[PDB]
């Protein structure tokens, strides 16, 4: 089935068992106090190595405290870092994966001041804790504080710190070393003409901008020797106006190859300061592969690997078969499913837990200096935790799950995996719940992969799925289970609005279930994520859509990474929006609003969608109580409205805790 993905490859002298690479992932799992590798990190990367990845890259480790850009970033500075690095490499290597250590000083994106650092020694001098760059400047992004200009001595010291970092990985058993020269971190800052305004030998011409990187590579190569795998990450496109051209990145890569033997090029898209789309659901698998083509026709000798929304085995298989890339590189697909390569090579892609590019647990949690998580994978950051271990139940119990939404299905899946006799009762004709409604939204197309995954799991695990079956007190009693799991989800709220009883008033459920005929003008009351995604579905159909929000902002519950994605779509679909509006009443011809400035305006509508929020659909739970079965639990939105991340996590936690005694 995936002959090309499962084909081996030589990276330097090292034979890699397949063409699947798990990319560097800072996750805030290392010791926040000192940058040491701890059990949370070890077990996280061990799961990717057990999952079958031919290559497993560590997260980018800082080379100096000023280069620390994440609260729990791994450190590559002191002798006290060595024991942890050895444990990490042992764990990856034992599984048969090629361990690769990444070196990443975050430069302009450093946040040492936020990590209890009040001063540091840099270039033999006492300095403040501010980020460093080739040129003293500010960021368009408020998360990044103004940087200080590195002295030539600090530059020389950082080259040596990179050599020492590579020495540290090699002495602790890592199979190779990766230089992170991307996305706006220190090296990328010297490479880009946007960040590098130096007039000495470290800036000006492209040759000078590349010097810091070249000297780092030359130094590492001399340190580790000729036989040791030296790989690197470099941008193919920075998506920065006034940055380097795509062709300049190729010239830099050519300078790299001429300086040292590069054993693998990982090619990347954008900077953290880039406004445009790079990693979102706006980009589909293969949307960036033309860049890999240009590197190949430019004559780059080293094998190439590429990630960046490559979440499909079929797309990667073709890309590798056609020689566009030599290795399928991935980060978020490996967060979502650490066993993706094992599934690809055993010919079961239907078992893949696909990353939907939600950017919640991964990007967003890491950037707000929180412990990384994953929406679709509740095990992320918990592989090391005994409370998340999946253990066979000795005494099989009869488990009745009410509701085939994500929380119900994840619970049923885990309870069946552990050996319980599981039944799902679902009132509609199909599984998915609100995920089955959301999949209709333009940016939620990868939610069909979540449906496909759970549909295939129910089948394989022998879960008794009872579709078109509304669970009642009587049908639960007839079933007589040992454990009743209520996972009936949420329902649209009914706020106290004048004229809410109008015929014009509908809800997000009736829209997505096709239970309402919509006109040419559709007006949404509510500016939350659910209201916006439904409005995008209504607008895609070529309808005139207005979103009215009483609060200060629309998309208020949408993480920073998805905000711009929604702006682009709303503009593209000619969607109108109003904020700080008072909803006065709903009537026959639309909705009467009063702006924050005092303007009374009539919003013309053929349909009024009241989408201010969701209530817990807890009628069944209130009707049956806690005594209808020996064990009664409520999970997901029926236990209190949260979102998809919490529903899936509640399901996993419910599924693992169902005891056998
Ligand atoms: C259009 C849309 C877009 C969304 N977008 C996002 C997003 O981007 N990110 C995010 O975090 N969240 C989003 N959400 C919310 C998210 O989908 C929900 O939080 C989540 O699906 C709730 O999971 P659940 O298992 O608790 O309930 P549900 O998904 O609501 O499932 C409940 C299930 O129980 C069934 N059922 C109900 N009563 C009975 C009964 N008595 N007997 C049998 N079956 C019954 C229902 O038919 C349904 O299948 C969105 C929701 C919608 C509708
Ligand atoms: C939480 C998170 C942390 C990341 N940490 C790193 C890092 O340590 N070093 C690095 O070079 N890239 C890092 N990246 C970039 C990824 O390795 C990857 O190239 C990117 O997410 C695009 O690939 P994908 O679509 O497979 O996720 C990070 C990405 C995420 C989601
Ligand atoms: S949190 Fe969302 S984007 Fe990140 S790995 Fe999980 S499914 Fe993918």
Numbering used by the authors: 13 to 673
What does the original paper state about this entry?
The architecture of NCR clearly reveals a spatial separation between electron uptake at the FAD near the surface and substrate reduction at the deeply buried active site FMN cofactor. The two flavins are electronically connected via a [4Fe–4S] cluster with edge to edge distances of 6 Å to FMN and 9 Å to FAD, respectively.
The [4Fe–4S] cluster is harbored in a linker region (360–400) inserted between the TIM barrel domain and the FAD binding domain. The surrounding of the isoalloxazine by negatively charged residues (E446, E541, and D649) destabilize the FADH− (deprotonated FAD HQ), but not the FADH• (protonated FAD SQ) state suggesting a low-redox potential, similar to that of flavins in flavodoxins. However, two major differences between NCR and standard OYEs were identified in the polypeptide surrounding of the isoalloxazine ring that should substantially modify its electrostatic/hydropathic properties. (i) The helices 371:380 and 572:585 shield the dimethylbenzene ring from the bulk solvent in NCR; both are absent in all standard OYEs. From these three only the arginine is present in NCR (R245), but a hydrogen bond to the negatively charged E341 counteracts its positive charge contacting the N1–C2–O group of FMN.
